[PDB]
Short mmCIF file of C-alpha atoms and ligand atoms in Angstrom, two decimals:
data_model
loop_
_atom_site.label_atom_id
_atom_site.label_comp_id
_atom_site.label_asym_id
_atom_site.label_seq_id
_atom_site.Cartn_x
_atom_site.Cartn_y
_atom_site.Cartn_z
CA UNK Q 1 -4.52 11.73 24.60
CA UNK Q 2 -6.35 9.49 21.75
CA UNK Q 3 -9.83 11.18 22.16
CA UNK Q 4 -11.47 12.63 19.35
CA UNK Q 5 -10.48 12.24 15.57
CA UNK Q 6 -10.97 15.64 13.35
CA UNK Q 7 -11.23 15.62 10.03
CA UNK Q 8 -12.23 17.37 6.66
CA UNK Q 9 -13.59 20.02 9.15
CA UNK Q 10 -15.47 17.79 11.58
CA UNK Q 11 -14.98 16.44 15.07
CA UNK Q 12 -15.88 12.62 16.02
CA UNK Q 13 -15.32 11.49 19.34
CA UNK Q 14 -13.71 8.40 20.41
CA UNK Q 15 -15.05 5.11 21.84
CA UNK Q 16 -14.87 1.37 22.06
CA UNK Q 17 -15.39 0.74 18.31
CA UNK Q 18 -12.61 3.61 17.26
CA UNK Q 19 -9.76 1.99 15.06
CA UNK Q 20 -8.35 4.68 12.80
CA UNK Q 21 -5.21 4.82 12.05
CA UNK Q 22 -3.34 8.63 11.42
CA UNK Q 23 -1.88 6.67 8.98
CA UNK Q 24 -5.21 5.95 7.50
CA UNK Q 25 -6.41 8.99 7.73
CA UNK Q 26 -3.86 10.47 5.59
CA UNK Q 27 -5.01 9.27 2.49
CA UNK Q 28 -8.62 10.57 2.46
CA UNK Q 29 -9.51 13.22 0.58
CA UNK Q 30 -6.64 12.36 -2.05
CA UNK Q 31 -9.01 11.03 -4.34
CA UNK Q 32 -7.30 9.70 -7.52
CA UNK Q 33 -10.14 8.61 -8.84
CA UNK Q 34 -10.74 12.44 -9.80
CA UNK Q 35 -6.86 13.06 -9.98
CA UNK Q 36 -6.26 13.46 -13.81
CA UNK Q 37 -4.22 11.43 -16.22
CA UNK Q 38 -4.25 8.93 -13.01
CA UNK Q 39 -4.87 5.40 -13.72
CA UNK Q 40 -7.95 4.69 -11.54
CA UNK Q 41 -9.42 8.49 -13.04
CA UNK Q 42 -8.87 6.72 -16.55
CA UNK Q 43 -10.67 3.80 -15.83
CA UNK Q 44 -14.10 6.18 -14.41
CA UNK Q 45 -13.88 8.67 -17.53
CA UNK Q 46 -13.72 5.46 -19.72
CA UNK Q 47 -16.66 3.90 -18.02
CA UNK Q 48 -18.45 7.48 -17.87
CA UNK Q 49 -18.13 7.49 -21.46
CA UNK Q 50 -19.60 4.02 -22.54
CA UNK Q 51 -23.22 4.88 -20.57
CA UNK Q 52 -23.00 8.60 -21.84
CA UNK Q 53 -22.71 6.94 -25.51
CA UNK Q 54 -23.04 3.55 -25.67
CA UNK Q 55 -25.91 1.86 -23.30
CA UNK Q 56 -29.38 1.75 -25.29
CA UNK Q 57 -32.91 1.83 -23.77
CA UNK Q 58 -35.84 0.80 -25.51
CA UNK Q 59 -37.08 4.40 -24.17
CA UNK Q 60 -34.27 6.46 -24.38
CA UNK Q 61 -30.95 5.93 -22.94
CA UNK Q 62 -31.47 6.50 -18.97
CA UNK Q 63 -29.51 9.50 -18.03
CA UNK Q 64 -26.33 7.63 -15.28
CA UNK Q 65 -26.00 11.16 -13.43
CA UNK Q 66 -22.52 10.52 -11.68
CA UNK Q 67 -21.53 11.37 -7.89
CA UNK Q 68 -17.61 10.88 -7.83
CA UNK Q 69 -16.94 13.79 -4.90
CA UNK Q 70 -18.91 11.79 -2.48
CA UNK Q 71 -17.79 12.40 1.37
CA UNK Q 72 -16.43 8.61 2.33
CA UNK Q 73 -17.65 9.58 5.99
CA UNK Q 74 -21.10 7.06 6.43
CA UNK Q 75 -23.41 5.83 9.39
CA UNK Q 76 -23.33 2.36 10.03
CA UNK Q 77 -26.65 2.61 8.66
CA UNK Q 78 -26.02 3.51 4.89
CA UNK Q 79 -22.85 1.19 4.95
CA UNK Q 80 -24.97 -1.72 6.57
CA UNK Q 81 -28.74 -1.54 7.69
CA UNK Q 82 -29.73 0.75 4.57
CA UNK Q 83 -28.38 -2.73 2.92
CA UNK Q 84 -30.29 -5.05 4.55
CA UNK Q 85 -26.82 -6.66 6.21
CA UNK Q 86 -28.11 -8.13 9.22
CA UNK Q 87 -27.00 -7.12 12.69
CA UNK Q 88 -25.02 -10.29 13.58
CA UNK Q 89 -23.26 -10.31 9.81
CA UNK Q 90 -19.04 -10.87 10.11
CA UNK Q 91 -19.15 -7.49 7.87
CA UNK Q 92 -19.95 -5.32 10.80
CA UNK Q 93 -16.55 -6.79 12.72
CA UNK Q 94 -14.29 -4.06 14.19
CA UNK Q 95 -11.61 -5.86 12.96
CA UNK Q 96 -12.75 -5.59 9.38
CA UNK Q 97 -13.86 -1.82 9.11
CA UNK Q 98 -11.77 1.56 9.95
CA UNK Q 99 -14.79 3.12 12.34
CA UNK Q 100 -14.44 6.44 13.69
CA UNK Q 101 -16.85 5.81 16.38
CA UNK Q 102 -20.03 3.49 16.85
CA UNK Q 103 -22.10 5.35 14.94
CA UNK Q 104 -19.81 7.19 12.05
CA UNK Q 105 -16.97 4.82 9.95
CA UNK Q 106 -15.09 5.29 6.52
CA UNK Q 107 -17.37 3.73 3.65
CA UNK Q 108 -16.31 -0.27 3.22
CA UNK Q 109 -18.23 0.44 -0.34
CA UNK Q 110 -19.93 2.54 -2.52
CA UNK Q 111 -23.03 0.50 -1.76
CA UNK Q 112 -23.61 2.68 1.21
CA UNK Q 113 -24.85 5.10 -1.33
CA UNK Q 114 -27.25 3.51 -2.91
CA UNK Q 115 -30.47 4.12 -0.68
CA UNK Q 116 -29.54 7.86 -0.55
CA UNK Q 117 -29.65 8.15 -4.13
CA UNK Q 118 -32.24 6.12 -4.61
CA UNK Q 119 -34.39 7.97 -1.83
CA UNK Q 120 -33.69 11.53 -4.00
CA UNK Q 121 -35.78 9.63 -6.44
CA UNK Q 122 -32.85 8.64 -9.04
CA UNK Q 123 -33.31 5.64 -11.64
CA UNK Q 124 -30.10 5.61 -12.50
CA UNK Q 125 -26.36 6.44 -11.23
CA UNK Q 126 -23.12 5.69 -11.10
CA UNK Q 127 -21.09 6.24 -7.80
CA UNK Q 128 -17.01 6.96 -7.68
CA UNK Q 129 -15.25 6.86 -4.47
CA UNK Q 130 -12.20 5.42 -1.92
CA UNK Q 131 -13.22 2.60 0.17
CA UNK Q 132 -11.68 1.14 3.70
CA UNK Q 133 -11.07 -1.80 4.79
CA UNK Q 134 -9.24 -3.60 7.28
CA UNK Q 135 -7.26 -6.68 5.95
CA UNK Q 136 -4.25 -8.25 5.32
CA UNK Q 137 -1.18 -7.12 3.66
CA UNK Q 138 -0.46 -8.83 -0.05
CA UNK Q 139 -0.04 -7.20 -3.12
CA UNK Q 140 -3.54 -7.20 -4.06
CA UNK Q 141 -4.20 -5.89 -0.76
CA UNK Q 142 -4.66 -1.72 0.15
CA UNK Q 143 -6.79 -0.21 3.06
CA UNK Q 144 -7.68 2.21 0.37
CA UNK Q 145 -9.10 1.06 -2.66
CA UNK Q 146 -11.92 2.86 -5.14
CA UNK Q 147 -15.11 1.16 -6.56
CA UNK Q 148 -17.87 2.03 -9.04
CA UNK Q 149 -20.91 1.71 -8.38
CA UNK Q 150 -24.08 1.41 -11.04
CA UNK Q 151 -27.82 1.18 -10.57
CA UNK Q 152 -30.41 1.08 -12.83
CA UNK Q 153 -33.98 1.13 -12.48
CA UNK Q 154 -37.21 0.00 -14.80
CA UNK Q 155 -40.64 0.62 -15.17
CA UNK Q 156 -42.70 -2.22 -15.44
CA UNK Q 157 -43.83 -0.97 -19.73
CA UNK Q 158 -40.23 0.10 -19.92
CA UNK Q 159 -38.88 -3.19 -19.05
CA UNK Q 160 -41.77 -5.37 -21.10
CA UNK Q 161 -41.70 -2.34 -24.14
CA UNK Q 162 -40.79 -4.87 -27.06
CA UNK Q 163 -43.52 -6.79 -26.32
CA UNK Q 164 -46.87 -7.37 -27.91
CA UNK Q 165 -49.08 -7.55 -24.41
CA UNK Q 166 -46.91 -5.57 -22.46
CA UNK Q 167 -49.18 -4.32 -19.99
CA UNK Q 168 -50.92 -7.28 -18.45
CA UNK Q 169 -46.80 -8.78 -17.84
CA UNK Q 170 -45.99 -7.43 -14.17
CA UNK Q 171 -42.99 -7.00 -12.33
CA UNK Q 172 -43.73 -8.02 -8.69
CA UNK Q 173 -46.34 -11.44 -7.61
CA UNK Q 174 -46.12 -13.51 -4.07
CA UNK Q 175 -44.20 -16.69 -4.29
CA UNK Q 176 -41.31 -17.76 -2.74
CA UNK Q 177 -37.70 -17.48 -2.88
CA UNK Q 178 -35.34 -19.51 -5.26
CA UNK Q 179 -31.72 -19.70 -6.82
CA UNK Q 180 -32.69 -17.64 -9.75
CA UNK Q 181 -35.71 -15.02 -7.91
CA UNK Q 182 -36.74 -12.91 -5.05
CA UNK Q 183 -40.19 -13.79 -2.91
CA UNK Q 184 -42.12 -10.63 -4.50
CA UNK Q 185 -40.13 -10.56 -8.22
CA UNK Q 186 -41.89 -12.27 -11.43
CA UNK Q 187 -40.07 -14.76 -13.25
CA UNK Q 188 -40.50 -13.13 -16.78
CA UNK Q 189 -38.74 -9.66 -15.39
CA UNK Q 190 -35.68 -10.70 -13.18
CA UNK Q 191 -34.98 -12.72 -16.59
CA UNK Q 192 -35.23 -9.41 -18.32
CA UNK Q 193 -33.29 -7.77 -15.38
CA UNK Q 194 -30.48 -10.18 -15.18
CA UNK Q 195 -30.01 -9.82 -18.80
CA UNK Q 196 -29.49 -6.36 -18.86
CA UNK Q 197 -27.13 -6.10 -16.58
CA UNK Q 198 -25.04 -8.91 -17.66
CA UNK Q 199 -25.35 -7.65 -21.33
CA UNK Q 200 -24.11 -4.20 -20.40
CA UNK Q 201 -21.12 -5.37 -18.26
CA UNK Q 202 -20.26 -7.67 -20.96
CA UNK Q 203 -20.37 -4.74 -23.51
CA UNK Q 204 -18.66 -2.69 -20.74
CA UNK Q 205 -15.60 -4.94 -20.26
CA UNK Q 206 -14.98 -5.01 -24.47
CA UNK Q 207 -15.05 -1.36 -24.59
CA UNK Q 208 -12.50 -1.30 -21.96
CA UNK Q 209 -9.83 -5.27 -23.08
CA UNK Q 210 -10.98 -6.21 -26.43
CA UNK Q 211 -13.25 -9.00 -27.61
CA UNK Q 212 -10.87 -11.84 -26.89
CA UNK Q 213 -11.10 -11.40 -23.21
CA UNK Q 214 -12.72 -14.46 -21.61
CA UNK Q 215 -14.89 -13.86 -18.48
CA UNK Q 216 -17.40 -16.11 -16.81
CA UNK Q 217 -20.09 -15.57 -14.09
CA UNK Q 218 -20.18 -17.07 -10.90
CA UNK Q 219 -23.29 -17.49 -8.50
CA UNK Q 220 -22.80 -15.64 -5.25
CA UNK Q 221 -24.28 -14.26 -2.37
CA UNK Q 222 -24.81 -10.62 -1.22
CA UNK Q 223 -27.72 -9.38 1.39
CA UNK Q 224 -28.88 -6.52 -0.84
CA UNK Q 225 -29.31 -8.08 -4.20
CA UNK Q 226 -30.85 -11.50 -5.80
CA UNK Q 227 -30.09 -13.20 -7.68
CA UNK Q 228 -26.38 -12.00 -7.57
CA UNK Q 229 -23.22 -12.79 -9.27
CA UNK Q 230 -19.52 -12.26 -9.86
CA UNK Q 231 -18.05 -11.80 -13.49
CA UNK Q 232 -14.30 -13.35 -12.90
CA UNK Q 233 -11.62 -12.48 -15.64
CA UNK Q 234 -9.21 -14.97 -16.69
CA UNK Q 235 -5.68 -13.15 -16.14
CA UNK Q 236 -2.47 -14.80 -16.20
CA UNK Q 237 -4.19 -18.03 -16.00
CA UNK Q 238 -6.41 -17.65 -13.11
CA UNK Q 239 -9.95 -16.38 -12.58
CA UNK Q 240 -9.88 -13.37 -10.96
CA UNK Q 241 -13.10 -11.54 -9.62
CA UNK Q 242 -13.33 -8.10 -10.72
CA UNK Q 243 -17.21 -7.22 -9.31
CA UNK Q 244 -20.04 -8.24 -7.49
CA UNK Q 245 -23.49 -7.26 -9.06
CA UNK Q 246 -27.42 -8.44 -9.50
CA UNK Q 247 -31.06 -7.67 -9.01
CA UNK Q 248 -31.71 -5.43 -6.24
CA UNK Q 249 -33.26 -6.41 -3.62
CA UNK Q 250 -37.42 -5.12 -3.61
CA UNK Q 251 -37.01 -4.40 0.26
CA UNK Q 252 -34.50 -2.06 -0.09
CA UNK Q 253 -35.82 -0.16 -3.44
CA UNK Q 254 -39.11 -0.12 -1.85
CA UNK Q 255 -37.75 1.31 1.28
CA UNK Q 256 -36.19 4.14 -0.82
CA UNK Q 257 -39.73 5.40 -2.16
CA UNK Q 258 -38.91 3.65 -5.89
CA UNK Q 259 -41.79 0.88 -5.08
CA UNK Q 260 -42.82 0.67 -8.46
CA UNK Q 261 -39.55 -0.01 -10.01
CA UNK Q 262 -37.05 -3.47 -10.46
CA UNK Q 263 -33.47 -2.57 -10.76
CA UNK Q 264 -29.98 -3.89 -11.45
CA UNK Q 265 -26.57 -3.01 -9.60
CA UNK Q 266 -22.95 -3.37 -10.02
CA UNK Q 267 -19.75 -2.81 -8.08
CA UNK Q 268 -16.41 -2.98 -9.63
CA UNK Q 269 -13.30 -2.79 -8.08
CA UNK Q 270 -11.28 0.08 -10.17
CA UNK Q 271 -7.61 -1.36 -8.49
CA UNK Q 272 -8.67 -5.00 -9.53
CA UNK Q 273 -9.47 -4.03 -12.84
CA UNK Q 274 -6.48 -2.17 -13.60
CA UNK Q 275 -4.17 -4.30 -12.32
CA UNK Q 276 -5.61 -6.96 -15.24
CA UNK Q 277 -6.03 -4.38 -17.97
CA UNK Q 278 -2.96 -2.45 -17.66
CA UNK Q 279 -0.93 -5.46 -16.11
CA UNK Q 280 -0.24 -3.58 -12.66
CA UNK Q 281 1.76 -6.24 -10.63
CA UNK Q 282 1.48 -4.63 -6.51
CA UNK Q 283 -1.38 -2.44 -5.55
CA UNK Q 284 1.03 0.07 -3.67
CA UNK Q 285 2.03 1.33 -7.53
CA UNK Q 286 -1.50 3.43 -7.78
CA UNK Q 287 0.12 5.59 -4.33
CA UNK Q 288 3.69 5.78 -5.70
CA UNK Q 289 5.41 9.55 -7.12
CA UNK Q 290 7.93 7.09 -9.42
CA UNK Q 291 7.40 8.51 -12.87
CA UNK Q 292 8.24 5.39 -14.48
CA UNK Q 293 4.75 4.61 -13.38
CA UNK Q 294 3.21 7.55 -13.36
CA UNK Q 295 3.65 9.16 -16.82
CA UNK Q 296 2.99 6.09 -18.43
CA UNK Q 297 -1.32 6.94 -18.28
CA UNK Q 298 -0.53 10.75 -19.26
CA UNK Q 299 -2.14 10.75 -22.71
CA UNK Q 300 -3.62 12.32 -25.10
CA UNK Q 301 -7.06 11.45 -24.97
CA UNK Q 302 -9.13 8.99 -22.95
CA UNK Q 303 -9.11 6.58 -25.58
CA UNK Q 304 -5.58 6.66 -26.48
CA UNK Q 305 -4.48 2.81 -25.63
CA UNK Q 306 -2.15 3.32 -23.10
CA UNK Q 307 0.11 0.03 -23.24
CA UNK Q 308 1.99 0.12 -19.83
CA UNK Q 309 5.58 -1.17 -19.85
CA UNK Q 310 6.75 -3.12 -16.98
CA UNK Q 311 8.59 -1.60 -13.93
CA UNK Q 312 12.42 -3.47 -12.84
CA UNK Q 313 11.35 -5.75 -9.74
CA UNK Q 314 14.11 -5.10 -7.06
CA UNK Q 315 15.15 -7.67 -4.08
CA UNK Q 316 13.15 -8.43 -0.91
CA UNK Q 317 14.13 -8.96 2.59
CA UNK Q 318 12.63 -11.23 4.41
CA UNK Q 319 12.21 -10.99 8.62
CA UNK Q 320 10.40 -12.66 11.09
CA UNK Q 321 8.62 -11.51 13.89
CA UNK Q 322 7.24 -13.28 17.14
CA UNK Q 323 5.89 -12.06 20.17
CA UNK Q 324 3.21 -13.45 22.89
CA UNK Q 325 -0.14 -12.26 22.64
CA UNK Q 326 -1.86 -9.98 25.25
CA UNK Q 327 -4.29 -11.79 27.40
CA UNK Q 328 -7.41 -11.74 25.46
CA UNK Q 329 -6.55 -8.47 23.93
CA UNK Q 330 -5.35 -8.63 20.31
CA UNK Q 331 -6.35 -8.96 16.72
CA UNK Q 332 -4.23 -10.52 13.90
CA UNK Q 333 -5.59 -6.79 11.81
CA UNK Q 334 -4.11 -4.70 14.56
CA UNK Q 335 -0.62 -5.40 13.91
CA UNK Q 336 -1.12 -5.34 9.87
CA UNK Q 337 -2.35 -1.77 10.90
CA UNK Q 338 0.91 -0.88 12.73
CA UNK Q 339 3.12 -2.34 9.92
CA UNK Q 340 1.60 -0.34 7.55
CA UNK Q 341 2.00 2.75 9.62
CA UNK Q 342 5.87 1.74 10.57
CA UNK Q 343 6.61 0.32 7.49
CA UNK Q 344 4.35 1.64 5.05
CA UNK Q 345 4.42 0.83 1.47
CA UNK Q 346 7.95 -0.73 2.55
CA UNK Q 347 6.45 -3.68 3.06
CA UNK Q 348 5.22 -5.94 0.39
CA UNK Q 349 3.45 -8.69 2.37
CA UNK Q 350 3.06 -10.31 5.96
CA UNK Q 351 1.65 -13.72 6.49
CA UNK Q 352 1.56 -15.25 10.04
CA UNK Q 353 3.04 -18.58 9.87
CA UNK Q 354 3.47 -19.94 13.41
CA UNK Q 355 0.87 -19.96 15.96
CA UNK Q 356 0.74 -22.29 19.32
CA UNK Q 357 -0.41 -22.26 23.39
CA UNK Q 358 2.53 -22.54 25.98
CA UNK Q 359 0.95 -24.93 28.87
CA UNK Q 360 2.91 -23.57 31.98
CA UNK Q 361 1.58 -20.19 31.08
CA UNK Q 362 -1.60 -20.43 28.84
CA UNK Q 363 -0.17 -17.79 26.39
CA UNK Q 364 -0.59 -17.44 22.83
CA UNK Q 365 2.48 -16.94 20.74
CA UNK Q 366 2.59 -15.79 17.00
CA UNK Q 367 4.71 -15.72 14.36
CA UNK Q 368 4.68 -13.31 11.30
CA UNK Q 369 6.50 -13.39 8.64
CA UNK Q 370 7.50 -9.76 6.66
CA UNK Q 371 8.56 -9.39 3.05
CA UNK Q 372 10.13 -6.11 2.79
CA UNK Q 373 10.34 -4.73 -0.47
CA UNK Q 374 10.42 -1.49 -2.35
CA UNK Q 375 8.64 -0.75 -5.39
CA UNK Q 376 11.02 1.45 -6.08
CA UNK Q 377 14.99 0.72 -5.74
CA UNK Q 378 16.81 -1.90 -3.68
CA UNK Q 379 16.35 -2.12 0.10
CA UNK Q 380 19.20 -2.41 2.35
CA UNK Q 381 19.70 -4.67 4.95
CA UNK Q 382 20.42 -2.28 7.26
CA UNK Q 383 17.46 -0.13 7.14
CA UNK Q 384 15.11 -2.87 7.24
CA UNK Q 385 16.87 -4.50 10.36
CA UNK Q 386 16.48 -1.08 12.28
CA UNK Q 387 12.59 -0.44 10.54
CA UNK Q 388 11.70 -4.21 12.18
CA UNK Q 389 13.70 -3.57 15.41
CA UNK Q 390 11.26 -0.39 15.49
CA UNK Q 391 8.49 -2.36 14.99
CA UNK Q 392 9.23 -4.64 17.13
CA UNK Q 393 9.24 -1.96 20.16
CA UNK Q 394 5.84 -0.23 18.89
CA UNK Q 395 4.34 -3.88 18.53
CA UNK Q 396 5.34 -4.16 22.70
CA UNK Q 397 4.66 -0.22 23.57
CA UNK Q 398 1.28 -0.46 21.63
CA UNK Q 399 -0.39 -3.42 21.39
CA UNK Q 400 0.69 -4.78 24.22
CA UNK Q 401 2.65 -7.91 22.83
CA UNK Q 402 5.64 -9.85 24.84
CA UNK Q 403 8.65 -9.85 22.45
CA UNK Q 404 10.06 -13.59 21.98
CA UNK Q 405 11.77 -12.46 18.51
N1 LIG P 1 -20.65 -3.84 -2.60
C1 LIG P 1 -20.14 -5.09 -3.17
C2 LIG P 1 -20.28 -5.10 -4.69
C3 LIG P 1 -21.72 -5.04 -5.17
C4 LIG P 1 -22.32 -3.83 -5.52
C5 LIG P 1 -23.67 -3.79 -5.96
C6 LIG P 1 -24.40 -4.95 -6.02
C7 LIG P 1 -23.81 -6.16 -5.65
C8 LIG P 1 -22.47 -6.19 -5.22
C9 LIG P 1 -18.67 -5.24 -2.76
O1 LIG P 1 -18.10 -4.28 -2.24
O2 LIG P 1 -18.06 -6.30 -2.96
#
């Protein structure tokens, strides 16, 4: 019936926290990250090159030894415990991850590699790969998408080398928690930490706009690193957030076997980033055969300054959709999950607009509203009426909803 999901040779069984969609599953393995002359592929070589060439150490350069071809099959354990993320943390919801059963899911980052690699006794490494996630549908929105990851590790006379008294400066003390330091980390090397990393993104995102690009960090929060932060790029006159990144956290590198060693990490979302430097408008375009898009990152050399040229925007259509919920039995992510499998890269955004309680009955009714539109050529409005009349009898058939329309 619905038991048992197989795939890239394996066999996971079904349960309670399954939520894969075929639809889903289709795009794993594609990997354009490692598809050449591909946009997001671009992006990794180019970053592959500047810590091949360009990082520094006051030793020597650490060697970034670079796992792209990682399997984006995880235990809840390297996507979340191996991270510190505590049990009750919104993170873990079923309505937020694609989980092939309680105990396997489909990576939510490339974080969920870090403790591996770090337990096979690496100081430094970058990490390629599709992530899932369950969300809504926008144009900055996919339930694929591909980060890269970076960590990078010190010794405590690496890290103090360019100093006079290196040796009696330590990494690691007892104290207690602030804004700008971990419990067990010494003031003088998350300064030396945090300056690191923020000097090589910094060097990182020049080698990859230009020097008039203007970025700015913002504080934030994230289990397995502090303190942390998010470099925001200003695009089209908004900041936009482009990674997450900080010191790691000394629980987790110590758990790893690397107790004698502070480190940095980054994450960087490889869609978010292209979309500013190659001014990409809808995230469906990376998934797309059009040529018009596609030939435009076919060049010469990895360096050659592609200068993309913009794409014809064509019409949308605009329906709306409204149905009674099932008695205690539905999430809002459930239905983005079937319009992406009806609809597909059809559909350019859905926003619920309408929601209310009817008092003779005690149901919930919802309204969605579905912009329809192709990134490729005009939509008619006759295939759209009979793809949302489709819809419309899945959303009933499958998810149990009471159409009001
Ligand atoms: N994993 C974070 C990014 C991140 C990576 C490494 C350190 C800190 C943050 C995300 O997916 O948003």
């Amino acid at each position: 019936p619905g038991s048992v999901v197989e795939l890239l040779g394996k066999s996971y069984p079904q349960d309670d926290h399954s939520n894969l969609t075929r639809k889903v599953l289709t795009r794993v393995g594609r990997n354009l990250h490692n598809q050449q002359h591909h946009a997001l592929w671009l992006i990794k070589e180019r970053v592959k090159e500047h810590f091949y060439k360009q990082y520094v150490g006051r030793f020597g350069t650490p060697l970034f030894s670079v796992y792209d071809n990682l399997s984006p099959v995880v235990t809840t354990w390297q996507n979340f415990d191996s991270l510190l993320i505590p049990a009750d943390h919104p993170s873990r919801k079923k309505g937020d991850n694609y989980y092939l059963n309680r105990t396997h899911m489909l990576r939510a980052h490339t974080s969920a590699h870090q403790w591996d690699l770090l337990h096979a006794g690496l100081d430094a490494f970058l990490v390629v790969g599709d992530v899932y996630r369950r969300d809504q549908i926008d144009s900055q929105h996919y339930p694929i998408f591909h980060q890269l990851e970076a960590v990078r590790l010190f010794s405590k006379h690496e890290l103090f080398a360019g100093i006079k008294d290196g040796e009696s400066l330590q990494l690691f003390e007892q104290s207690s928690r602030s804004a700008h330091k971990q419990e067990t980390h010494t003031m003088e090397a998350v300064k030396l930490v945090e300056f690191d990393l923020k000097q090589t993104l910094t060097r990182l995102m020049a080698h990859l706009f230009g020097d008039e690009l203007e970025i700015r960090w913002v504080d934030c929060y994230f289990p397995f690193t502090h303190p942390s932060f998010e470099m925001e790029i200003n695009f089209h006159g908004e900041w936009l957030e482009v990674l997450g990144c900080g010191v790691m956290e000394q629980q987790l590198v110590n758990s790893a076997g690397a107790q004698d060693r502070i480190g940095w990490a980054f994450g960087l979302g490889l869609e978010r980033l292209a979309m500013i430097l190659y001014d990409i408008p809808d995230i469906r375009l990376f998934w797309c055969e059009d040529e018009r898009f596609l030939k435009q990152f076919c060049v010469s050399n990895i360096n050659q300054k592609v200068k993309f040229q913009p794409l014809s925007k064509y019409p949308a259509v605009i329906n709306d959709i409204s149905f009674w919920l099932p008695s205690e039995n539905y999430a809002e992510n459930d239905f983005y999950d079937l319009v992406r499998t009806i609809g597909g890269d059809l559909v350019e955004k859905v926003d619920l607009i309408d929601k209310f309680v009817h008092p003779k009955t005690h149901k919930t009714s919802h309204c969605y509203r579905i912009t329809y539109r192709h990134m490729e050529r005009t939509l008619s409005q006759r295939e759209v009426r009979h793809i949302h009349q489709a819809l419309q009898e899945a959303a009933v058939q499958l998810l149990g909803v009471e159409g009001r329309f």
